[PDB]
Amino acid sequence: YNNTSGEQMLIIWGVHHPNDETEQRTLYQNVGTYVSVSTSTLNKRSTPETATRPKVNGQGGRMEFFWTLLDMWDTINFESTGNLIAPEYGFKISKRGSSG
Amino acid sequence: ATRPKVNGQGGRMEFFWTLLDMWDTINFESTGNLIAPEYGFKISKRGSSG
Ligand SMILES: *[C@@H]1O[C@H](CO)[C@@H](O[C@@H]2O[C@H](CO)[C@@H](O[C@@H]3O[C@H](CO)[C@@H](O)[C@H](O)[C@@H]3O)[C@H](O)[C@H]2NC(C)=O)[C@H](O)[C@H]1NC(C)=O
Numbered sequence A: 001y002n003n004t005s006g007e008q009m010l011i012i013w014g015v016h017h018p019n020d021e022t023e024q025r026t027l028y029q030n031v032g033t034y035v036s037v038s039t040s041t042l043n044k045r046s047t048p049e050t051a052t053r054p055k056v057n058g059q060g061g062r063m064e065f066f067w068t069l070l071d072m073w074d075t076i077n078f079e080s081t082g083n084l085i086a087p088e089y090g091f092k093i094s095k096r097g098s099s100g
Numbered sequence B: 001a002t003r004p005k006v007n008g009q010g011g012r013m014e015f016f017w018t019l020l021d022m023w024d025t026i027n028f029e030s031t032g033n034l035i036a037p038e039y040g041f042k043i044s045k046r047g048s049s050g
Helices: A021-028
Strands: A009-017 A035-038 A043-046 A062-070 A077-080
Antiparallel strands (some): A009 A062, A035 A077
């Protein structure tokens, strides 16, 4: 993505930590997966790991979520060989202010 | 990995800094990608700067 809207855009994405090697492959058909997210200042290469985790809501795997800001014409690059949970919706901030 | 073209380069330099306190032998080991220091900055004095 190339920033166009003229303000910091909150881009929020995530990665999936599957609970089973079989479940990992049945979702992504490969292992040793990585999710790279790079901007003009941010660089983050998460490596999802499949391991036995306590049953929460019936699932063992989790979602790690990250958030970032595309400041000003800062092109963001998502790259992955799986496990990525992409954002289809970037939250541009309309205004500054004083909230809580 | 593919990174946005900054100054024509995609790759970056991560930089770290550390303090060798007192006869603390430092060991750099690498099979590549290391950017070594040939210059250690000893601090002459304490003080109050800004
Ligand atoms: C896509 O991302 C780039 C990030 O580099 C945004 O920056 C724009 O990049 C273009 C070249 O790709 C440049 O435009 C230049 O404008 C000057 C103004 O006189 C002109 O003389 C040049 O011929 C060239 O057209 C410039 O670095 C920059 N444009 C700006 C800041 O207005 C680019 O805006 C992004 N594309 C979008 C948002 O559509």
